[PDB]
């Protein structure tokens, strides 16, 4: 945990990560064209700082592709009953992230020619967002599950910025290694062609001398 | 029908205080990797840090020079398996 | 500038930068030996988002090496009156940053052999810090001014991290573009040595043919 | 001997159609910060200012229009000067 600080809420120190991988998702905006950009997902389970007896599920949608992007979703154990009654879920709180991960995996491994084909789409409405995994069969585009997303508190944004910064620093070290390799190889090519032209001119001069 | 474990774990780059490891990924879809580094058979608490599934490499820092450490990568693969199907190496700086 | 969110407090958009350069300062930690790092400083004057009639001074201490070391100091005009009474300052709020910058300039231009020699030192106690400029005379190390520093608000830290991330991403993008150019140069130099060795081998063959003609 | 210490040797060392990098030798006085203002020569282009630390002798400008002559100005922040005082200007056509 880089740059840590305590505000009453979700205890990120006691968090348990369940899913953290890029997922291909269609992004839809009202004024923009629909583009298939591979967004990174994060699934977290844990307890609140106030009470460890209360369990909380947390979902983060980030975009390593763009420059800044983060949306958060919090589900309490109490709120899970409401969501389960609204969307007709049958599993318990514990298996909810497992089923979400199963649907996301079905979505990522989707091949272009498949019926039914699972897909994920995120619609951005200003600051808020609505994420739904859909099934496109021979008939219709039926939604499996629909979840609502909003922006995040300043703390989670801070830690996401720190993670992105660390990733970019690692890339920059790799880049310095690659530039050393490529410039040394280019210099080698130059010096070898130079030595070859010198030898060619010398042999031509010798040929002129003999003739 | 598949390993569901990591296959090739080797140290590509090494400095006296920190190490960088790289591993080939299992064929199954990997949710995330949990990298646990600890001192060999010593009373050092095992330290775990999480890396996304897309990563096949990782870096460990804060190591003591000249000490043989045990580095284990736990894979969170499909079928909800967690801290399971590990691959381990031992390396001294 | 940066990602726009709730920015209640200091309005960075209406900020006016006065000083922004690295200055050598000794850092004191209980565990770490004291290290002379030219920590970067930045001084800003402005107004609060809540009320534009109230003036606020801001000082940030950053570390280009370790970018997790951020420390902030905020001074309102009323707090300026309190500090002026506490440390016996005589100037007004307007001339405070000028004198601070003058002392910092005395700190930067300090040569190893100088009497009296002005130096800057920061003592780090956890997240908190105390910064003081000192005079090293032939007698004692007397403190000129003593300042307290605190961890920044989550908002200012967010925007500072965003600024550094943007700069580092731009640097890496430019370097990748130049590396594409270097790969093109490598391809050209390859093709050129290949053609040159081909020509040299041909000339050697011609020389061998002439030698056969002589024999 | 307090020189006004304006920046000297303001030049574009490397240039691409969309971006340029400028370098200047630093004035003798301790420079607090630099304010670089790039704008198009005449027309309705607003003057754009961005700040760079005093320790840096170089800077990079992006977002330029190709084939257009721009005016670049470097303001120096010294002790006895104003951060929009003591300017030196050059003209360059990307």
Author numbering:
A (entry chain B): 7 to 217
B (entry chain H): 0 to 92
C (entry chain A): 7 to 221
D (entry chain G): -1 to 92
Task: Tell me, in the authors' exact words, what the paper reports.
Centriole biogenesis begins with self-assembly of SAS-6 proteins into 9-fold symmetrical ring polymers, which then stack into a cartwheel that scaffolds organelle formation. SAS-6 proteins contain an N-terminal globular head domain followed by a long coiled-coil, and a C-terminal region predicted to be unstructured. Moreover, SAS-6 homodimers can form higher order oligomers through a weaker interaction between two head domains from neighboring homodimers, with a ~40° angle between the two coiled-coil pairs. Here, we developed monobodies against Chlamydomonas reinhardtii SAS-6, characterizing three in detail with X-ray crystallography, atomic force microscopy and cryo-electron microscopy.
The binding mode was identical to that in the co-crystal with CrSAS-6_N, with an overall RMSD of 0.855 Å. Moreover, we reasoned that upon landing on the mica surface, a CrSAS-6_NL helix might display predictable spacing between spokes emanating from the N-terminal head domains depending on which side of the helix they land, with a maximal distance between spokes of 26 nm given the fourfold screw axis. We indeed found examples of CrSAS-6_NL higher oligomeric assemblies with such spacing between spokes emanating from the head domains. Why is such a helical configuration imposed by MBCRS6-15? Computational modeling based on the CrSAS-6 crystal structures raises the possibility that a helix with a shallow pitch might be present transiently before ring closure.
